[PDB]
Every structure is written in C-alpha cells, then in structure tokens.
Amino acid sequence: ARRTWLGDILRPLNSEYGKVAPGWGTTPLMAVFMGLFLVFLLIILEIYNSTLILDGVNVSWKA
Amino acid sequence: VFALLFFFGHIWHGARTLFRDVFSGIDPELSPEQVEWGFYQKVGDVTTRK
Amino acid sequence: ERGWFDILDDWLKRDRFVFVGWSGILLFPCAYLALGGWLTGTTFVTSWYTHGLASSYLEGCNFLTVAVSTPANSMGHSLLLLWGPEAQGDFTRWCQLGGLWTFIALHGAFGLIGFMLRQFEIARLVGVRPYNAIAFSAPIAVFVSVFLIYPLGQSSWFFAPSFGVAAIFRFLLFFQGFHNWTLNPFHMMGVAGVLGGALLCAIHGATVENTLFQDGEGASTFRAFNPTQAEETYSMVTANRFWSQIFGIAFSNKRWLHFFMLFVPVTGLWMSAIGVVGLALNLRSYDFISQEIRAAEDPEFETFYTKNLLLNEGIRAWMAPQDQPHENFVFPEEVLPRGNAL
Amino acid sequence: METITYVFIFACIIALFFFAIFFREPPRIT
Amino acid sequence: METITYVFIFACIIALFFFAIFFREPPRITK
Amino acid sequence: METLKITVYIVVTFFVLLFVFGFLSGDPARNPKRK
Amino acid sequence: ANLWERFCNWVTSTDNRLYVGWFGVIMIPTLLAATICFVIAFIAAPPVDIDGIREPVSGSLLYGNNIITGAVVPSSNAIGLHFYPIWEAASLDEWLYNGGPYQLIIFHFLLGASCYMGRQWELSYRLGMRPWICVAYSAPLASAFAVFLIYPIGQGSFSDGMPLGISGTFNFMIVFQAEHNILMHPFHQLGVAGVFGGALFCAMHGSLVTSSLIRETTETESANYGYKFGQEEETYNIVAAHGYFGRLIFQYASFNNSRSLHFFLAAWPVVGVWFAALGISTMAFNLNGFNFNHSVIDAKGNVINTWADIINRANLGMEVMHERNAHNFPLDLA
Amino acid sequence: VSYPIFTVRWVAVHTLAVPTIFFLGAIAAMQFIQR
Amino acid sequence: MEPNPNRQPVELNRTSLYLGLLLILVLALLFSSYFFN
Amino acid sequence: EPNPNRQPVELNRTSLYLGLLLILVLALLFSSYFFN
Amino acid sequence: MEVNQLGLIATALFVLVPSVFLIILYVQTESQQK
Amino acid sequence: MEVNQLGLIATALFVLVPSVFLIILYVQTESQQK
Amino acid sequence: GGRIPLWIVATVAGMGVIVIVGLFFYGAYAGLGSSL
Amino acid sequence: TTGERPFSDIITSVRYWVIHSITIPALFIAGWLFVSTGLAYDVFGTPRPDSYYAQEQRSIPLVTDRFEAKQQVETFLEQLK
Amino acid sequence: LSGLLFLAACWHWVYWDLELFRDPRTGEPALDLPKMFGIHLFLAGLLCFGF
Amino acid sequence: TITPSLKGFFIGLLSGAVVLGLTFAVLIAISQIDKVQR
Numbered sequence A: 001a002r003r004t005w006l007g008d009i010l011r012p013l014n015s016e017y018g019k020v021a022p023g024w025g026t027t028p029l030m031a032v033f034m035g036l037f038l039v040f041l042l043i044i045l046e047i048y049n050s051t052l053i054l055d056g057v058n059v060s061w062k063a
Numbered sequence B: 001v002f003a004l005l006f007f008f009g010h011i012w013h014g015a016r017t018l019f020r021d022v023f024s025g026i027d028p029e030l031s032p033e034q035v036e037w038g039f040y041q042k043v044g045d046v047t048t049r050k
Numbered sequence C: 001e002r003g004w005f006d007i008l009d010d011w012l013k014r015d016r017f018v019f020v021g022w023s024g025i026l027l028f029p030c031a032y033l034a035l036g037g038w039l040t041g042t043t044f045v046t047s048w049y050t051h052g053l054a055s056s057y058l059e060g061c062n063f064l065t066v067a068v069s070t071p072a073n074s075m076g077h078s079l080l081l082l083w084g085p086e087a088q089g090d091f092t093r094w095c096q097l098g099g100l101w102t103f104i105a106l107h108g109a110f111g112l113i114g115f116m117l118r119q120f121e122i123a124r125l126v127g128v129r130p131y132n133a134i135a136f137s138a139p140i141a142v143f144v145s146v147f148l149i150y151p152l153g154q155s156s157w158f159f160a161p162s163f164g165v166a167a168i169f170r171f172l173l174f175f176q177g178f179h180n181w182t183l184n185p186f187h188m189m190g191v192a193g194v195l196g197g198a199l200l201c202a203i204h205g206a207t208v209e210n211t212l213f214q215d216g217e218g219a220s221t222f223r224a225f226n227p228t229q230a231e232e233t234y235s236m237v238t239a240n241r242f243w244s245q246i247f248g249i250a251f252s253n254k255r256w257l258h259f260f261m262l263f264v265p266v267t268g269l270w271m272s273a274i275g276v277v278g279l280a281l282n283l284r285s286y287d288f289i290s291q292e293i294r295a296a297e298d299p300e301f302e303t304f305y306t307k308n309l310l311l312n313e314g315i316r317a318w319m320a321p322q323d324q325p326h327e328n329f330v331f332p333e334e335v336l337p338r339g340n341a342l
Numbered sequence D: 001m002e003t004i005t006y007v008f009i010f011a012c013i014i015a016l017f018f019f020a021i022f023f024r025e026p027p028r029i030t
Numbered sequence E: 001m002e003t004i005t006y007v008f009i010f011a012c013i014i015a016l017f018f019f020a021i022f023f024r025e026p027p028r029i030t031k
Numbered sequence F: 001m002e003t004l005k006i007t008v009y010i011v012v013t014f015f016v017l018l019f020v021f022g023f024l025s026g027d028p029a030r031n032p033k034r035k
Numbered sequence G: 001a002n003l004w005e006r007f008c009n010w011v012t013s014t015d016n017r018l019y020v021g022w023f024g025v026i027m028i029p030t031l032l033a034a035t036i037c038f039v040i041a042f043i044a045a046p047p048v049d050i051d052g053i054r055e056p057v058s059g060s061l062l063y064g065n066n067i068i069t070g071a072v073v074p075s076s077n078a079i080g081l082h083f084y085p086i087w088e089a090a091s092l093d094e095w096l097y098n099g100g101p102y103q104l105i106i107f108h109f110l111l112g113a114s115c116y117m118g119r120q121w122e123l124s125y126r127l128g129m130r131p132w133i134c135v136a137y138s139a140p141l142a143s144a145f146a147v148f149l150i151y152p153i154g155q156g157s158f159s160d161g162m163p164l165g166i167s168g169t170f171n172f173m174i175v176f177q178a179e180h181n182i183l184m185h186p187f188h189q190l191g192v193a194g195v196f197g198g199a200l201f202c203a204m205h206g207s208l209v210t211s212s213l214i215r216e217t218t219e220t221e222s223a224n225y226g227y228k229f230g231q232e233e234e235t236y237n238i239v240a241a242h243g244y245f246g247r248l249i250f251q252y253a254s255f256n257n258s259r260s261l262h263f264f265l266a267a268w269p270v271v272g273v274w275f276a277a278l279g280i281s282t283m284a285f286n287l288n289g290f291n292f293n294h295s296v297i298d299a300k301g302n303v304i305n306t307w308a309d310i311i312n313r314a315n316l317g318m319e320v321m322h323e324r325n326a327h328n329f330p331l332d333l334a
Numbered sequence H: 001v002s003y004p005i006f007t008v009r010w011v012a013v014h015t016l017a018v019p020t021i022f023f024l025g026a027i028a029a030m031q032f033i034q035r
Numbered sequence I: 001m002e003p004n005p006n007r008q009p010v011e012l013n014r015t016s017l018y019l020g021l022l023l024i025l026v027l028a029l030l031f032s033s034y035f036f037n
Numbered sequence J: 001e002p003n004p005n006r007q008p009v010e011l012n013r014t015s016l017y018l019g020l021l022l023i024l025v026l027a028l029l030f031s032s033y034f035f036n
Numbered sequence K, L: 001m002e003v004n005q006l007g008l009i010a011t012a013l014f015v016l017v018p019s020v021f022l023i024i025l026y027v028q029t030e031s032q033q034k
Numbered sequence M: 001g002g003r004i005p006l007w008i009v010a011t012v013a014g015m016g017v018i019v020i021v022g023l024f025f026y027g028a029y030a031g032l033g034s035s036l
Numbered sequence N: 001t002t003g004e005r006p007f008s009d010i011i012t013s014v015r016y017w018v019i020h021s022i023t024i025p026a027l028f029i030a031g032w033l034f035v036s037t038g039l040a041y042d043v044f045g046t047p048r049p050d051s052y053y054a055q056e057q058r059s060i061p062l063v064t065d066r067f068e069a070k071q072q073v074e075t076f077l078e079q080l081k
Numbered sequence O: 001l002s003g004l005l006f007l008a009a010c011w012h013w014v015y016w017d018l019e020l021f022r023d024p025r026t027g028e029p030a031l032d033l034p035k036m037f038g039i040h041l042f043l044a045g046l047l048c049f050g051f
Numbered sequence P: 001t002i003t004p005s006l007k008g009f010f011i012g013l014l015s016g017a018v019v020l021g022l023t024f025a026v027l028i029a030i031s032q033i034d035k036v037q038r
Ligand code: CLA
Pocket: A038, B010, B011, B013, B014, B015, B017, B018, C026, C079, C106, C110, C112, C113, C116, C117, C120, C140
C-alpha cells in the first residue's frame, strides 16, 4: 500500500476496525433516545394530521 | 415512486447483510434435526436439544 | 443463556405449534385486531353516516355486500383515533364516523410488517435464505400503495377502498370510469405478472406431476416420495425435451426456473403499485392525445379506445351522485349521457 | 413513422423467437 | 434540440481526448 | 371466389385425411414401452 | 418401407426439433393461417362495421391505431352467427368491411389451439410421460373458447365475441359487466381466486425452493451454476423449506411431499380458471351475477343502498352508453 | 405422555374460536329480524 | 501500475441475452404507444 | 464437427479511439445538414 | 396522426441502449477462453 | 429554428450504431485470454 | 386419548356447519336483506 | 411433534365434550341475545329498521363536519324522535 | 464542481491502494464504519447548524 | 394550555405504554418461570 502525507495524517481515524464496547454498553440510553424520537415523530405527525390541535398552532397557509 | 422502490432496496440489502453466510446457498450438511419439530426446544439452537 | 433479554429470546423462540418470535409481539396483536375489526364491523357496524349505506349482517347485508367502509370525505385524512378530536373517546360515535376503517388499515399495515419480520426471523433460525420475505414485499407494496398512498393523494380516506367484497368491486369500476386504469401500462404489467404467475404455477405443477419417476407400485403416486431422499422426484431431462419440442423452448436449470417463479408475480405486483402511486395524483394514462385530436376533427374516426371513454363517461355520470354523496350532485335527467333507447 | 416503429419492434421479436428456438444454447446432460 | 445535439457531440469528443491521452494503451519497448 | 372455395375445400380435405389415416396407422404402438 | 409408412414415421418422430404429430398436421396450417391473417389485418385492415349499423370501427395501425388501441374487429352484427368465409363475399372489399378476417382468424385459431392441446397429449405418450399436461392447458383453452365462440353463440352474434386487440378486450370486459354483473358472479370470483392464488403460490414456491438451494457456488458466481441439467440429486433441501414454512404458519399447513405440493400447484389455478371459463360460458346463456339491487329496505319501505346498489349505478353508466346508436327499443335483450 | 392444558396454542385457538361462536349466535339471531 | 486484485470477469450467457432482449423489446412494444401519445 | 474457417476478431484500444474519433467528428460535421 | 415528435427517438433509444448493453456483455463472454 | 424533425434521430443513430459496433469489438478483444 | 370416534365428531360437526349456513341462506329470502 | 396434546386426542375425549357441550352453546346463546335484546344496535350505533330516516325526512344524515361530526350525529339522532 | 469531482474520481480509481485503507493489524482493506459515522454525523450537524 | 386534543394525545400515549408495559411484564415473567433446559 501507498503512504501519502494526507493518509498519514488521517491514519488514526481509520485504525479501530472491529473495536467494541463490552456487552450491552450504551444500548439502554440508545433505547431511551429512540423512544423519545418515536414520540417526537408521533407529535409532528398528529399536528400535521390535525389529530393534535394546539393553542396558537394554526396548521394552514393562513395564520 | 422512488421512495416505494427504495423500500425494496432496503429489504434486499438488509437481507444480504443479515444473511451473508447463506448468500450462495444453505449448508450442504444441514442437520435434518435443526428443521424438524421438537428435536430442539428453541428453534435453531443445538444447545437446547430435548 | 444470560440475562433477561436472552431468557426472553429463549422463550419467544421455543419450538411450538404456533411459533412466536420477537416479530410475534408486533404481528399477533396487529393481525388479530385487523381481522377482528373486520369481522366486528361487517357483522354489526353501519356506513349510514359516512356513505349513506347499510354494510353489516345486522342491517341485512350478505357476505358479498358487507364492508367496513371508509370515513366520510369531511374526515379528510384523519387518523380518526378512538381518543382523537373527532370521536373524543366515544366508541359508538367512533364506529359511526368510520373509525374501524383506519383501525383496520393501520393495524393491518403494522401486521404485514410483523408478518414480513416473521419471515426474516424464522428464515434466520432455520438457516434458509430470506427470499420468501423478499417475495412478500410485493403484497406490501400493493397494500401500502392502494390503501395508504392512493387515498393520501386524493381528498380523503373516503376514496380508499372499503373493506368488503362488493365495496372492492365498486373500487375497480371507479378506477375504470375515473382513471381509465385498464389503459395504464403499469396495470398491464401487473396483469401480465399475475396471469403469467398463475400460468407458471399451473404449468410447473403439471409438468412435475407428468414427468414423475416410478418410485412405487401404487397407481396413486403420492406415496412414492420421501422428503429426505437424495434424488429428484421427476425427470428434468424429459420435461426439458417435452417442452423444447412442444413450445420451442424449455427450462434446463431448476434453480433459474424457481427464481423466475419468484420474479414474475413479484415484479408484476410492484409495477401495479407504481401505477397506483400515479393514480393517487390523478396522474393517469387516461388518453392518447393523437387519438383525441383526430376524433375531434373527424366524426367518422372510431376505435375501441374512443368506445371505452364513452363507457367511462357513462360510469362517471351515473355513479357519482350516490358514490360521492358529499358532493351533493344533482344531475337532471336531461344531462345524463345515454345512447339511443337505453 | 409510428406504424413503422410498431411493426419494426414486432419483427425484431419474431426474429428473436427464431434465434431463441433454433440457436439456443443446447441443453447438455450433466 | 439541435443545440443540445451539437454540444453533446462536442462534449463526447473532449471526453474522448481525455481517455485517448490519459488512458491510452501505454507504449512499451519489447524488452 | 368459386375457385378459392374449391381450393380451400381441397386443402382441408387433404389435411383431415392425413389426420384420420395417420391416427389409423398403428398409433398405440408408437410409444417407448409396450407395443 | 413404403412412402406412407416413412411419412408416418417422420410425422410421429420423437427426433424432430419441434414435434409434429397428427394433431400437428392440423395445428400447423391452421395456426399459420390465423397468425398470418391476424398480422396483416392488425397492420392494414380497413374499418369494420362491428355492430351492423354502418358505423365502421378502425382497428388497424395504418388506419390510425397504436398497439394499445389496435384490434382485429369482430364481424358484423348483420352476419350474426352466419358463417362468413372469404368466398361468401362479393369482393375482398366487402369481406373487409364486414369483419371477415375476425372469423377466419378465430376459427383457425380455436381449431389450432385445440390441436395444440391434443399434441401435448401426443408427445407425452411418445416420450413415455404421464399424460395430463394437456388437461392443465384445457383451462386457458376453455377460456379462449368461452370468449371467442360460446359467448357469441349464446348472444346470437360474433359481433359480441372478444375483439382481437388490447383496448377491444377492455371494451368486452366493461360491456360484459353492464350486461351480466360478472364481478358478482361466483364463478368469476373463483377465477380471481384461481389467478391471484396461482400468482401467490407461484411466488411462494419460487421463493421456498430458492431459499433452500444447497450451497454449490462461490459468492462471485450465480447460484444457478450450482445446478447442472440432468443431475440426479435434488438441488434444494425440501425438509429445510418445509421446516421454514411449517413454522411460518403451522406444521400441518405446509407440504413436505413434493408430489402433493406440485399437484396443488397444478390444481389450484387450473380449477379456478375452469370456473372462470364456465363463468363466461354460462353468462353466455344469461345466468348472471348475484343481483342485490334494492335488497335492503327500512321499516317504511325506503331503499337503503348497499355497495351492491353503488355497483349497479356504475353498471347503468356502461349500459346506457355502450353501442350508443345500435338500440331502438328499450331493453337490451342480447 | 402427560400434557399441559394451557399453552400458547390453547390461547391462540380460543382468541379465535370464542368470538367466532358468539358471532355465529349473533348472526343466527339476525336471520329472524324483520323490517 | 500494480494490478487491482478486486477485478473480476463479467458474463452474460446466451439465454440471458435472449431473455433480456425479450424484456427490452416487449417493454418497448408496450410503452411506445405512450411515448407517441 | 466445428467449422475450421472460424477466426477470432480484434479491435485494439487505439483503434477504438481512432474509430470513435472518426464517428463523432463525422456526426459533428454532418449533423447540421441532417437538421438543415 | 399527430404524435409526439419525440416518440420516435424515445422509443429508438429505449430499445437500443439496453439491447446494446446486453450484446456487448454477451459477445465478450463468448470471446473468453473456452 | 425550424429544423428537419428527423435530424435528431438521424444524428443519434449515426453516432450510436457505428460507435456501438466498435465498443462490442473492443470489449470482446479485451476479454480474450491474454 | 379418544372415546368418541373421530368420524362421528366430523359428521356431527359437518352437519352443524350445513345447518347454520342453511339458516343464513334461508335468511336471504326472509326479513332484512330479502328485498321484500 | 412440538409437544402440545394432539388436537385429535382432545376432540375425541369425553372430557373435552363435557366442558364444551356447555361453553359452545353458552357463547352462541350470548351472541343471540346480544342481537335479540337490541343491545348490538346501541353499542355500535347502527340504525334499527325504523331509525334510518324520520317519517317525512328527504335526505341522508351524512357527516359533513370533521370536528363536530360527533355532535352532528347526535343532532341527526334527536331529529328522528 | 462536476468537472473537479470527475478528476478526483480518476485519481482515486488509479491510486486505490492507499495505506489509509488497510487495517494496520491485518493488512486487509478495512473501513472503521462506526467512527466514520461519527465524523460524518458531526460534519452534517455542523453544516445543518450553519445553514 | 392543555387543549382537549393534547389531553387525548396523553391518554393515547399512556394507553400505549400500558399495553406495551403489561405485554412485556407478562412475557418476561413467563420466560423467567418457564426456562429452556440446556
Ligand atoms: C415491511 C416493513 C419492514 C421490514 C420487514 C423490515 C426489515 C428489516 N429491517 Mg427495516 N425499516 C422499515 C420497514 C421494514 N424493515 C421502516 C418503515 C423503517 C423506517 C425508515 C425501517 C428502518 C430500518 C433500519 C434503520 C434498519 C432496519 C433493519 C431491518 C432488518 C432487521 C429487522 C429490523 O431492524 O426491524 C425493524 C423493525 C420494524 C420495521 C418494526 C417497527 C415497529 C414500530 C416500532 C411500530 C410503531 C407503532 C406506531 C408508533 C403506532 C402509531 C401509528 C401512527 C400512524 C398513529 C430487516 C431486513 C436493520 C438492518 O438492515 O440491519 C442490517 C437496520 O439497520 N430497518
């Protein structure tokens, strides 16, 4: 393989192939963010759908 | 239209990923015990032989 | 095993009469509710307030005429949740507003996702390639295009198909009179993949049954087979020669043959789905402009294409006032298109 | 020009039928 | 349509110049 | 039209006669097993 | 041997690239005649007075059609079921105006396709095969007979035969709906189950076999190379496929017997399509789909519409518009 | 030998069988409704 | 100059050519009417 | 048994480039007259 | 018939471009060492 | 500009047909056992 | 372990299906849905 | 061969029938009564044969207001009595 | 932009065998996808924010 | 304000959490009580 100046500089950023944290690691915090993101999407969908109607939120061209 | 077609591309590549080991076909020595009912207590798990 | 996740995984994946799996948690309740919602509505629930129609055994409909009908056009594309702003938790009103429609459509959509996740999960446990799940994308593309995308492109769920035998017939005839959907080349490719798939289903079953090896003494030949046997049960060589000489070509590769049997109907359904996405926008193959320019200037020029648009025009004028009640159409007798006498 | 195009495609398909039958890859046992 | 056609042909020619020079069959002394 | 009709009548008779005599020419024997 | 004997030997040879056979002696000329007449008419035929009211319909490419609108147009309603060969006409020009090519094509085609079916029996016998592939083909063949011969006979006219064309076909479908309410007929419903289920089981079988192919190739090669024409060993694991499908649904819902499986694959579409064909062939004699028009009535006697009545309104639109200059009296009785 | 009574299968069967019979009783009654 | 070891030959067998020409020509026979409109 | 008159055919890379140059430059020359 | 003037070229290329793609791939397969 | 309506198809085929002929020949030369 | 023969269970069960579906057909001609 | 008691064992056993010769008929009768009492109409909001139209009313009680459709149906229903 | 990207593509096609793309432990081609995701996600976050 | 549809939103959300919560409670409990033998 060919070394270049830029390749030498970037080498550390492509040197941890396969490296894992032990076990479940941060999986539970991930799940919490996924849940909150599900709820966020449900909210924005229900607002656009007029299923969730909020004070001062007039979903229309005209305010 | 392209969104719907990309659903197929997702299903296809997700499949290729999770099933890389059988891409050319299934084990030629696949144990008939692994597909028959009640040999294992847990589908596809040799350690749960009943 | 290990922790609770792995003990749950164990139990979920037990080898039992009805396999469960992680997918089962999504599949089972959604499929159950979609099916029970259908049987519930068709047995007991009206469409008087949404369509001006009776639609249940309770009202006197039969298995052909019952349906769970779509919500009124004024509902727009409301999710129409039991607890939403329309029904406000009143189960009776929710039924009368068409809430069972979006109930069935949405649980049904999640159930199909769960079913296809089922096909992936079982394939992985048994160690087979997941082509069955892949083939099932065609049912998903159809369900999603027709029951979700189509009405989402139109004014409301009212124009989605209603869940019933006669209701679906009505949906076909609407698509003919309003979209000229038979003219559409994505529908034509659908039809080719359906009829060509049915053709391949029949011809491959008949060929195997008629090139069988004599593997028993019985004149009923089904017993002369063993799932575990090494050997092909029928002669590929003889089947190849037969069709080569009858039709001019034949399969010679069994693997290709079976992949082609996946390919044809799956591809045809996917093509029909694309045409329906276009119909969501009224982006139809309705006309050939060259035909219309000629026929407008030449009153002696007639083709089967011009004949069919006359039929469409009849369908629209005669069916619209009752089929689209929110429009309050009143079409005085004198304006209805009719040929002579009829 | 359109009639020509439609008949041209059709003629190519009939030619294709001819090569696919009589100049197929011949099936060989084993 | 004509302008597109002429510019297309011209563009293909320039692309050819690039391949003919940088992706030529390299001259080699039979050695 | 008269000539055409007579021609077609002859052609059809000719082919029908091949079919009938053909199938009369020991057809059951023309198989790979018991003759 | 004598000339006749050698001829017979050639006609029945298992060695001809295309099998000829005695059925083939009729099939070859009749199919060739129908094909040639069809191609020439589809390109060049002038307009045809399908409904016998001097209103000629243009079917051919040179007279302003495309592949989708073009047809060979059915013979004139004035003809009815009368046999209209070329020599019955005063001229080719008259023959063409009255839709002679349609009769020529469909009679030669039906005879030729019936011989195609016989020929399938014939070759299977020459090859020492079991004989019923020809019974599977009877289903599409019955359906062709229904739309090109039985229906016209019932209604008294080849002008009500299915046109030989893509848009013509849809015309026939739509008029058939107005006149018979075919969608509401259980034999057409069984045909739908036959073709949708045939598609379904086609995809199912393709996918189950494909899913259990035995590894015989590397990741660079098509797996199709893992099978060699004529090999003795089965190329997939049916016990694996059954293992999968029995779990997808439940064990006894899946076949582990390939013979039973392939019989089912033959039977389901063939039977459904036989009912499709018999649906058309019995609506030919006007035994029509279920009629629940105004079936639901309230306590006073108000009609409470159902989806059946909405169908009826679409049917009425088709009925009142179709053949808009051909009816003089109030009932369309054929 | 000695079988469990209540299984996932048992539950599957009754989620379907139970409303089915109830519905069939409802629909039988309906056949005697007059307008 | 060094050869890339990832290169692979490509194939299209005769049947595949015929199947593909059939797909293309039949698709063209179907879509051409719409293109002329 | 095979026809011994058969021969392989070749078009080297330089000839491809020469040829495509000929074709494109002739098209660039003639297209004006085609459109007229 | 007043057809779209681009129908012809659209149809021509629709056939030619992928047909030629396939022909190129077929011929170079045949020319690979027997 | 009111150009000849066949000039586009003529030019395209003029380019495409011989170019494709040369591409077919070149690629099947490259794929020959070297 | 059996005591009632399967063929009896099937015959009674089948007859029960026929009765209830017969009733449903009867109802197509009487009361609601009868057109009368 | 997944463990559970074979169905054909269960449905030919005296005990299965002792339980079900009561549960099956009881469910069927409860379904019957759900209709014969009229209860089905009120749970689901389905009109009785005398409740589709008021005596002289011309048109259908079609819902035309997304957010007050519930109130519309309620008003439509008093306008019968 | 199109022109410059085309030229870069040529460079990357010819000079494909860069040491940067080789796993330093095995000498096999390797891309550390999890870390590439954070790098690209960070950049995308930066661009989104600045937009 | 909490509009009547935001209150419905919370009720839907609560209901879903409960169906899921109880579903997972029951499944976990049953998996614990009924372990595969290894
Ligand atoms: C038929 C639908 C379907 C199927 C069968 C699959 C199948 C697959 N997915 Mg894909 N996926 C889908 C749709 C689907 N997906 C959709 C719509 C998205 C969102 C864009 C994704 C996003 C996605 C990602 C990002 C990944 C997968 C991956 C996978 C693979 C592993 C299984 C998995 O992760 O499941 C995912 C689970 C589901 C699809 C079920 C979700 C059920 C939701 C939570 C129910 C929500 C209920 C809702 C809140 C109710 C309110 C409704 C509202 C309208 C009111 C497998 C190939 C992974 C992969 O390929 O690994 C190699 C992977 O990384 N999926």
